[PDB]
Amino acid sequence: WEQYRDRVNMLQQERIRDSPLLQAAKENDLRLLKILLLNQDFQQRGAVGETALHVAALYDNLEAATLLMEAAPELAKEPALCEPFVGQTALHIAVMNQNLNLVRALLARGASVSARATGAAFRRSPHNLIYYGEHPLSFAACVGSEEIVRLLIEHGADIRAQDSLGNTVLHILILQPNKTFACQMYNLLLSYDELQSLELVPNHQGLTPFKLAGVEGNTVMFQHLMQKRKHVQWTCGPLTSTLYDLTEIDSWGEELSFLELVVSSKKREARQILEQTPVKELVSFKWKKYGRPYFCVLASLYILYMICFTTCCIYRPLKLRDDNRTDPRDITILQQKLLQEAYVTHQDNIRLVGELVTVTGAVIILLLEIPDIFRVGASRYFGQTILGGPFHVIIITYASLVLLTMVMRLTNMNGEVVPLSFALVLGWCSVMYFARGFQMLGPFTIMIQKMIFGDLMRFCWLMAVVILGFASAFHITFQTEDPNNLGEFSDYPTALFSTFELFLTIIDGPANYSVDLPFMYCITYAAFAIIATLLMLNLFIAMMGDTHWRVAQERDELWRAQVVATTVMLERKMPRFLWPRSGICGYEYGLGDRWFLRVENHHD
Amino acid sequence: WEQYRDRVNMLQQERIRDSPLLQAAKENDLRLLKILLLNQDFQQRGAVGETALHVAALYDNLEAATLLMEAAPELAKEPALCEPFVGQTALHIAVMNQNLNLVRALLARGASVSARATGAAFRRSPHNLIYYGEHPLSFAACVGSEEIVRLLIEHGADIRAQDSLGNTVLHILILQPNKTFACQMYNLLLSYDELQSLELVPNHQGLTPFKLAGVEGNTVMFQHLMQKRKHVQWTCGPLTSTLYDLTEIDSWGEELSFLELVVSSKKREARQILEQTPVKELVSFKWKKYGRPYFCVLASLYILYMICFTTCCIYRPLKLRDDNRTDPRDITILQQKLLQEAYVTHQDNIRLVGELVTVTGAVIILLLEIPDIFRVGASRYFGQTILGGPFHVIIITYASLVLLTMVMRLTNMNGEVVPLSFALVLGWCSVMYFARGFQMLGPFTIMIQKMIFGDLMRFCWLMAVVILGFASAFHITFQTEDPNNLGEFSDYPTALFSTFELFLTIIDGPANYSVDLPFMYCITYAAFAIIATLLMLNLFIAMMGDTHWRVAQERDELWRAQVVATTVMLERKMPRFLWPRSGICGYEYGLGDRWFLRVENHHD
Numbered sequence A, B: 001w002e003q004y005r006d007r008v009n010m011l012q013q014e015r016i017r018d019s020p021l022l023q024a025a026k027e028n029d030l031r032l033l034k035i036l037l038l039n040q041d042f043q044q045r046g047a048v049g050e051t052a053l054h055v056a057a058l059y060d061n062l063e064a065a066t067l068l069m070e071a072a073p074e075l076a077k078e079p080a081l082c083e084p085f086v087g088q089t090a091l092h093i094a095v096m097n098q099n100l101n102l103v104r105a106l107l108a109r110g111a112s113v114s115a116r117a118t119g120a121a122f123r124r125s126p127h128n129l130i131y132y133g134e135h136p137l138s139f140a141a142c143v144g145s146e147e148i149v150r151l152l153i154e155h156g157a158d159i160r161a162q163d164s165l166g167n168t169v170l171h172i173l174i175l176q177p178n179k180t181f182a183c184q185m186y187n188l189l190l191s192y193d194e195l196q197s198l199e200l201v202p203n204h205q206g207l208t209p210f211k212l213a214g215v216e217g218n219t220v221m222f223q224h225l226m227q228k229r230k231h232v233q234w235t236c237g238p239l240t241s242t243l244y245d246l247t248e249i250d251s252w253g254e255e256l257s258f259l260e261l262v263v264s265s266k267k268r269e270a271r272q273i274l275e276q277t278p279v280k281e282l283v284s285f286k287w288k289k290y291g292r293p294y295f296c297v298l299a300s301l302y303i304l305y306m307i308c309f310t311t312c313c314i315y316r317p318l319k320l321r322d323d324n325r326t327d328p329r330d331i332t333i334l335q336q337k338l339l340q341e342a343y344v345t346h347q348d349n350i351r352l353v354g355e356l357v358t359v360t361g362a363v364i365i366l367l368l369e370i371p372d373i374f375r376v377g378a379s380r381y382f383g384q385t386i387l388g389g390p391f392h393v394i395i396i397t398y399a400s401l402v403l404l405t406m407v408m409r410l411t412n413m414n415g416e417v418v419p420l421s422f423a424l425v426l427g428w429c430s431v432m433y434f435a436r437g438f439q440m441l442g443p444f445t446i447m448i449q450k451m452i453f454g455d456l457m458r459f460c461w462l463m464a465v466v467i468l469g470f471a472s473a474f475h476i477t478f479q480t481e482d483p484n485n486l487g488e489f490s491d492y493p494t495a496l497f498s499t500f501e502l503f504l505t506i507i508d509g510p511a512n513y514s515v516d517l518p519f520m521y522c523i524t525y526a527a528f529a530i531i532a533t534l535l536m537l538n539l540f541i542a543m544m545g546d547t548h549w550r551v552a553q554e555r556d557e558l559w560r561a562q563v564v565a566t567t568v569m570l571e572r573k574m575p576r577f578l579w580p581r582s583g584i585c586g587y588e589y590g591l592g593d594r595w596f597l598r599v600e601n602h603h604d
């Protein structure tokens, strides 16, 4: 909340400028500070509970801080006592200002090296511009001063300490945007670290520093981590045979693997870690050997199942209508057969076998799609475009509509045409889910997805506004006319549908040249042809062209992300005997229990 | 196979780390090596059959290699004895690591300079990252160390030696990606070469180094080869008159010429050699003087032949139907005349003359197109887009359909409309083959080809999926309705055709405003108008626009490649008296039997 933080900062500045000691410490006024510290409070606090030493350390005044530490040195151990800054000692502010002399003086005076800055300003939030952690070692690692890190570690800072989110100092080091010096600081902290190692300590969410580097899109820290796990077997000429380790990449026998955390991430940059050196090799092996033929087999089985469903839909049992067509505008000549009237002939028995196959396929689809929602969460399963969220919504709706059609068929309920048409359209449009397995058809589904949940939802309000206005105009111009001669605008729903058809130029303009149409229709339809047909439609065509160009710029990255997501899904759902553990065995060749991957690269 | 090569490498590293001698040679451990070589095997081998000297040479340990060569020097002549590395001595690994001292020590010890590295890793394959050949001189030329080349040649390496593919050292030099230093290495090896020259030695495929440089897209080596064949007549001011040699470019009196090998190549870069200095001049002379008027004459003759075929198709003999139209939905009022009933009047005799002209043209087309398939191969004749593969398929199908129509006409078989329509469409669409002879119409055929075998085959699966789903929905919504009022969806093939028409907006939406259509048709057609008409169609429009832009970026190169392919085809197929040998005579002007080409260029 910005209006509370501004009030806190203004009250802090008012309390600094009101007290003479805080004002003398702020401006580095040595004379007034010496006068006030010669004789008379040393423990007066501002609006945020900060002492005079915090004010002296905030404005980088070393001499005023030494003068304030000459008398009553316990201010080195006094933390702030207010909500936006809880526990912020002078050491944190001295480290953040990167003043080595003030940090050395505070550690000589005996400041707490394990004091936690548990305020609201130090938490990880979009309100806070920086997440530097809570312990002063985290601040010293994130700022980028190695001397302060060595001085804090030699004075007894704990490298294994965790903040309120559970993040260790490596986790807060990974999250920094300055990823160049952060690798050197990571190497320094790993050198100073000698139970389990600091690399295997997870946070409260459950992520290791390797997995957190994978999630947050930190490619440089990912390369720095993987350069400590490779093993160059031989470098012969331009050929180099590296042996990468898949212990923290494959994550075999785990609830959530590394690649599933990488792909199902809100950060955009994480897909770049699907283009790194061991990960791309690993997913290419797992896709070309196992993922692609199993995905093609599943696609062929689903296509045959949809063909059986379509064949059961076309041969739906219909009989002659018993009631006579009294209304001249009624064209219903057939109605649905009853349950006793149907399933008599042998062709109806073949249809019954096909319908049993269809309903068992729908039950299998529901049993395969429902527990993943409870496992991974409803917001992430239906939300991610790469994972196939809309396809999961479509296939769950299709299975529910097939079950609803079964219920309506067993209970002799008329009106199966509506769920059968819904199920046919959704089930056939869910065949395009299996187009992600091919590079020639992969990004096209993403193009249609970004044109439907993108430009279509951003232009349908303007389209519906124009449709409503011109449909109302076309209805009231033809309210006083004979509906037989021009019945395109006779009822307001039919006027809305006719104008929606005329927007996309899929029907002709209504014209009857043997009768006198009203002139207001002519002027209003000229306006509709200019504004809606010509101008606003071809704006949407250009928006779709820009969306197609935007996806086609990054088609390979998006198809690779779809490949990794499909490979992770097929490794998780299919049984283990169809998916052996990828990589070299390792134990057979005299090495440990780790599973390795050999990459031969052509350098120089 | 990667899973075998990884197993071989891991077994090799395990056998290195198991034996103490191989481990001492790997780590350059002098103490353990001296202890093991003082007293006790010197001939122990690893998983790939490599000796200890191969391990010492693989890790660039010169001192350990000299210690291993001090005792039992026969390890300098010991090759590996396993399948992925056959015959790989220590000299090949010493040359690949570019260690001149180790190569000199191995040649002093008496290593085999003609040992062949006939393993699977040294062959030319997409599995292997490098193709450096088999003989150590090929390795020394490909790595780029002139001192090793001179040391191997002075010790007795054969420059004329060929590997399993028949490639000499020049062939393996051309295939390298580092084409800058490869020209200098080529010049050094030609200087050291003093029967026929090394430039005229072909491989097992039949290609000279000039032809292999032409095929593989190596433009820099092509310039380096052509700078040894030019002859500057006079340089006056800014004008330079060079006299290029067409002995290895024109290839007169040969089964496969140089330009036919350049154009009909799987490599993309070979078309750049159609833009070089003598080749572009030569094909421009051969096209502007001979190829263009002969191609225009053939185009005019084929257009007149297709006009005669169309005129015979329009005047096809038809008589009144003998059977009465019993079915009210039947509109057949004419049927085909019999063979005895036809060919009676004088106009039928004119039609008979035209049909004889048509069938002789089809026989001529078959006799001109069939033996080229057996000559150049079915995979290359119908495969290359530049050569006109689809046009050859179309014209062979057209000739076969004309012959089938002749067979059905002679045997009084009804149903000539189907092969006549097939032959008319294919024969008229084969007129666009003759559009490659004009720069204003050249790349347009390539645009249509890349939009048909490209984006159309990559989008027709999604299009057919949407067509099948919405056709099934529109059929089952109108299964219970009267087919007289709205017969666009009455049968499932007719529903498929009507939805395919509604996809491309070539017919209107089915609407009958005098009767009550079902509302599910209205919602499903609104969905079809949004998803299929508006979104997915204009995605294909944008894909075709991107394909058109991609071809229009490189229109001149593609048209030049079409010109060279057409010129080669017309030089091969037409008789020799219409195609004199291009270039200056040479023998008349006191020079040799070579045929030259004069190029005047404006330098500076």
Ligand SMILES: CCCCCCCC(=O)OC[C@H](COP(=O)(O)O[C@@H]1[C@H](O)[C@H](O)[C@@H](OP(=O)(O)O)[C@H](OP(=O)(O)O)[C@H]1O)OC(=O)CCCCCCC
Residues within 6 Å of the ligand: A268, A382, A383, A384, A385, A389, A390, A393, A394, A449, A450, A453, A454, A457
């Ligand atoms: C029947 C289907 C139901 C699907 C329901 C669930 C649908 C579902 O799974 O995604 C919903 C969508 C997700 O976002 P969306 O599809 O727009 O795409 C993501 C993101 O929102 C941006 O739009 C994308 O970048 P840009 O802005 O294009 O540059 C970004 O690309 P990248 O940077 O990550 O690479 C994407 O990650 O959010 C909505 O807008 C709701 C519209 C709902 C409209 C329909 C409501 C029924």
Ligand SMILES: CCCCCCCC(=O)OC[C@H](COP(=O)(O)O[C@@H]1[C@H](O)[C@H](O)[C@@H](OP(=O)(O)O)[C@H](OP(=O)(O)O)[C@H]1O)OC(=O)CCCCCCC
Residues within 6 Å of the ligand: B268, B382, B383, B384, B385, B389, B390, B393, B394, B449, B450, B453, B454, B457
């Ligand atoms: C009736 C006609 C029959 C023709 C049969 C034979 C047709 C025939 O001769 O070419 C077939 C085609 C060749 O490849 P295609 O036409 O796509 O074009 C080549 C290549 O495959 C790439 O597509 C092109 O680059 P890009 O990817 O565009 O960037 C490349 O350009 P360049 O880099 O070389 O400059 C081209 O050399 O391969 C198929 O995909 C089969 C589709 C068959 C579909 C239809 C099957 C009946």
Ligand SMILES: CC(C)[C@@H](C)/C=C/[C@@H](C)[C@H]1CC[C@H]2C3=CC=C4C[C@@H](O)CC[C@]4(C)[C@H]3CC[C@]12C
Residues within 6 Å of the ligand: A390, A391, A394, A421, A422, A425, A426, A429, A430, A432, A445, A446, A448, A449, A452, B523, B524, B527, B531
């Ligand atoms: C049955 C009729 C009445 C209406 C409701 C039908 C709507 C269908 C055609 C629409 C609704 C949402 C659309 C839709 C949702 C999301 C996606 C995921 C995207 O990555 C590819 C396109 C795809 C798969 C499309 C396909 C067509 C769908 C499924």
Ligand SMILES: CC(C)[C@@H](C)/C=C/[C@@H](C)[C@H]1CC[C@H]2C3=CC=C4C[C@@H](O)CC[C@]4(C)[C@H]3CC[C@]12C
Residues within 6 Å of the ligand: A459, A460, A463, A464, A467, A493, A494, A496, A497, A500, B518, B519, B522, B523, B526
């Ligand atoms: C992009 C915009 C323009 C799209 C979303 C607008 C949708 C509206 C205008 C369309 C979509 C489906 C149409 C529709 C659905 C079904 C029926 C029932 C039918 O008996 C009368 C027409 C009627 C009532 C029309 C009214 C207009 C609707 C609701």
Ligand SMILES: CC(C)[C@@H](C)/C=C/[C@@H](C)[C@H]1CC[C@H]2C3=CC=C4C[C@@H](O)CC[C@]4(C)[C@H]3CC[C@]12C
Residues within 6 Å of the ligand: B390, B391, B394, B421, B422, B425, B426, B429, B430, B432, B445, B446, B448, B449, B452
């Ligand atoms: C007769 C009807 C029923 C159907 C089969 C006809 C198909 C024709 C129109 C289609 C089939 C394949 C198409 C086709 C094949 C390939 C090429 C080569 C390309 O470089 C230019 C376009 C061109 C020449 C086009 C022309 C139109 C063709 C020949």
Ligand SMILES: CC(C)[C@@H](C)/C=C/[C@@H](C)[C@H]1CC[C@H]2C3=CC=C4C[C@@H](O)CC[C@]4(C)[C@H]3CC[C@]12C
Residues within 6 Å of the ligand: B459, B460, B463, B464, B467, B493, B494, B496, B497, B500
């Ligand atoms: C790009 C996609 C959408 C293209 C290739 C799809 C093709 C399908 C949908 C089209 C192409 C030709 C069409 C076609 C050919 C001929 C006939 C015979 C006629 O008596 C009934 C319609 C029927 C049976 C239709 C069915 C639908 C077909 C097969």
